Design a protein around this ligand. Structure first.
Ligand SMILES: Nc1ncnc2c1ncn2[C@@H]1O[C@H](COP(=O)(O)OP(=O)(O)OP(=O)(O)O)[C@@H](O)[C@H]1O
Ligand SMILES: Nc1ncnc2c1ncn2[C@@H]1O[C@H](COP(=O)(O)OP(=O)(O)OP(=O)(O)O)[C@@H](O)[C@H]1O
Ligand SMILES: Nc1ncnc2c1ncn2[C@@H]1O[C@H](COP(=O)(O)OP(=O)(O)OP(=O)(O)O)[C@@H](O)[C@H]1O
Ligand SMILES: Nc1ncnc2c1ncn2[C@@H]1O[C@H](COP(=O)(O)OP(=O)(O)OP(=O)(O)O)[C@@H](O)[C@H]1O
Lengths: 267, 267, 267, 267, 15, 15, 15, 15
């Protein structure tokens, strides 16, 4: 439109992928969605953008793999007994490795080098750590590498910290790395006036902190809170659906797509 | 022999792979050596052992990949100008992802699930962190998963800490996880009475803290220091060459292979 | 509709993928499209269908890879001289291996075993060969395997034969294997009353050999000829666009999608 | 020695890998052996040689995979009933795709482009086919590509033909492609004066058609017959053990390794 | 028991 | 029966 | 000449 | 200059 004109000076993008975008039916990987996303990110990176990817959704794939392992090495007599709940940290550790190995496979097939950085909550308490991370990211972006961040859930001792979920980790990274636009890839077209299943609900062209502030009932509430916190500091935030392969290009070209969170746009 | 009789009650093994074992000629991956090692580890894990792998050697592969990227996207005129030194943290971050993606590929091809855990020096300062890592590792080993540890060099702010290198990280993990035998995979057959190139040098059947204490001149000195620290606390340590595919089986069967670091054996 | 009611007793499907569906921009693989197609085929195969895939589009990927190789091992002075045209058979041979390795990678990641069969024109001249191939395909389908046929372009001595292109190889296989529905995955929504770029053109609900026989003007003419030949013998043929991930489900459910080629439907 | 001096003008090498070299314990892939072989072949190809690889051993891996599939999708009640023998052609078709996908994976990781050509017995009956294949192989070798031949067992209607096994397919290719040395990678160090298990047996430095001709009792008899047929026409043949990673370099450097089949050397 | 006896490995891999 | 009842999936994956 | 001298490897990888 | 002009991409990929 006219209020999405900042999509022309955008140089660094922090793209966060949701769990509903990574894991498909049955808990396995969604190969089509992730492949289209990786193709779009490689095209953006070849174009001249500096793309930072904050991956998410390792707990689900990890749990699927660990259930497979239990079955394969389990025995009938046992399958007749009750089941147990698979540890959370074990699932996260198993899923992270598979997800990032798959990311490396497709990025290599796309002729793009991808790098894996893992940052915990206790690490962010040091300003010197922030400076190091900034220097490392700058050096990796100067060679056209896509840093794939995440949260070290497989070692976390864990809300009271700086960040508690990837919805907020993306905002913290975008604020720290001085990004220019933050895209929260979810499974919904954006932010609605009510529940998505409600027919009376309507899409939000842009979020207003004086009108749409208290007009929506909510998960997505954490996404909205992180978006408001990020857009308050001067980082425009776009909530868009990752089910489509051209949404990133549409928002980066200035089209009316997704929900916009901007401090200057809101009046 | 007779003093390597503890290789029968061994149940948990902490295997550390060196940089000279992972990276082959040209800085690329050594596919033959790593493939043989992965085959042996899968056979051990299927046998009934609980194998913990402490990988190493991501800085070299990472630097090779980053030099490739610089060239591919570099331009002639530039190749005519002087070169620069690639950041250390960028190289480590790029190399780690590729190494562990390759590990996942071969372990999947071997029908074994491998898990990636990353632990930094600042994390070990918390006893509660030690308890949570122990619980996670126990839960992952109860499902026949090979936890592939490493050091988060791609985020490490960095000798004054608990551990400073993987030679000592392996010892710290073995002491904390209550392992039963620690194998330091290097490129040399063990510990010699002098430099390996010296013809007069002889292999050390077992390390004695009263005789071979100062009979050796030295890298490998860090390996020996970590081995002495680990074997002091009651964890037997074996330094063996990873160039062969059956060395792990030989040491685990009680044969005379490698250099032994034992507190009870030494007199 | 009412004339697509045969999509309920369909048990065997012969799916042919076009070149415009496999190769994306720059001659590289289209990862999103092929990933969505592989996900859909794995879902169909798990559902209870017997899916036969007749792949295509190795010449393009092969040529891209061979140009990469020429450059990488080529030298400046040479790049200053004129270029040459890369052999056709060399390109086909290089591309086939990469395409089918990628197919195996995604099918393994999808927990489906895929098999590669290659059949040439000279082989089809033997009736005993037809019986052998039928027996092999039956044995492979009884174990829930997806036979990935193709044409041995890398050994072909080469129109006068039984089949000359994959558009006709799919029809020959469907007739020989007694399939029940043949889907020709192309990049267009189907068959139009004229050129697709013509605004006055309209989609064809079903092809009539007494009306649309000569009305349509035209590549796609080979597709239409193969479709008419297949549908004459009693194998219903559907021409549908592979750019969407749910077109196969839509045609298999009886919805109005694509262009239909049926001998009984046409009047 | 002195009679292995022809290893200096060697320019094209036809390397045949046995079944005992590809498939490891349990019918799965031998990752260490194949990785070392691929590393050696990539080093040779980078050196300046023109390496042709005639792969073998898809029936075993294929049968393992098909048994896995039967079990996974089989059901207890059924496992209680008798088993069946898995078709030969289905096993070959499934195994070939996996083997060559793995070959592509390691060759890509080694920065070498590998190409897959499949040739049947009926195809060799045409001289024009021989010319076509020679032209294709020349064009593929001029771009530093490793053509990975095999036998189309998944389509073969099938001894009365030109070739019946890969031991003889390698000889036929070496004679047709005008190779300079043929290496038959087996699991034994070469040709012995008797059974390998016999302690009195001794290794044969070179095969003599007037002495060793009837001094050996025997599988390996097919290997010896193919070697004699190839070496009669003027192609030196070396039978060497593929269990070691440096045997190819040793024979190509002129060292005394393996068993030699030469028409000029024999007196 | 019967649900497991008359079941297959892939059926179990599901919830 | 018992060999199968008191067996595991990976044991079967072997001859 | 100049087009090649002031060019990069990835630019060439394209037609 | 000459070392680069009369060189290939893979030669550079080495120290
Ligand atoms: N008003 C609302 N509008 C849209 N979505 C809503 C709303 N209220 C709840 N939701 C839910 O919030 C979900 C947000 O998606 P998702 O599960 O990826 O969120 P998340 O908690 O940010 O994810 P992740 O675990 O990847 O960080 C939607 O899929 C939808 O089901
Ligand atoms: N007396 C000695 N005996 C054996 N090796 C020695 C000796 N002195 C020095 N070395 C060197 O120490 C090296 C130890 O191998 P390596 O490079 O893997 O060590 P590291 O510093 O522990 O490795 P990493 O970086 O993987 O932790 C040997 O390769 C050898 O060159
Ligand atoms: N009337 C028409 N309607 C639709 N497409 C047409 C028409 N005339 C020509 N075409 C062209 O035919 C093409 C058919 O697609 P495609 O290139 O895959 O065909 P193909 O020759 O069957 O492919 P392949 O090489 O994979 O066998 C369309 O992409 C379109 O550009
Ligand atoms: N006198 C002998 N010397 C050596 N090996 C012998 C002898 N007699 C029989 N053999 C057997 O021949 C085998 C040859 O190996 P291999 O199984 O690869 O043969 P092949 O039939 O040529 O293989 P492939 O199926 O790969 O073509 C040896 O492993 C050995 O067991």
């Amino acid at each position: 439109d006219r209020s999405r004109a900042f999509a022309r000076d955008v140089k660094r993008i922090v793209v966060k992928v949701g769990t509903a975008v990574v894991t498909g039916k049955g808990g396995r990987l969604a190969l089509g969605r992730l492949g289209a996303l990786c193709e779009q990110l490689a095209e953006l990176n070849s174009d001249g953008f500096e793309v930072i990817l904050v991956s998410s959704g390792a707990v689900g794939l990890g749990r699927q793999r660990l259930r497979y392992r239990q079955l394969v090495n389990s025995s009938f007599a046992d399958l007749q007994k009750p089941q147990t709940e698979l540890d959370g940290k074990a699932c996260a550790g198993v899923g992270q490795s598979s997800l990032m190995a798959y990311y490396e496979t497709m990025f290599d097939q796309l002729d793009v080098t991808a790098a894996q950085l893992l940052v915990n909550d206790s690490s962010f308490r040091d300003k010197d750590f922030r400076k190091q991370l900034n220097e490392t990211v700058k050096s990796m972006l100067d060679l056209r590498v896509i840093p794939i961040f995440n949260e070290n859930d497989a070692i976390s001792t864990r809300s009271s910290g700086i960040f508690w979920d990837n919805d907020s980790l993306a905002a913290l990274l975008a604020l720290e790395l001085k990004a220019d636009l933050l895209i929260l890839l979810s499974d919904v077209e954006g932010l609605y006036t009510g529940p998505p299943s409600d027919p009376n609900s309507k899409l939000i062209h842009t979020f207003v902190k004086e009108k749409h502030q208290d007009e929506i009932t909510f998960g997505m509430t954490a996404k909205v809170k992180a978006a408001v916190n990020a857009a308050y500091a001067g980082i425009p935030v776009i909530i868009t659906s990752g089910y489509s392969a051209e949404n990133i290009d549409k928002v980066l070209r200035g089209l009316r797509v997704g929900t916009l969170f901007h401090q200057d746009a809101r009046l």
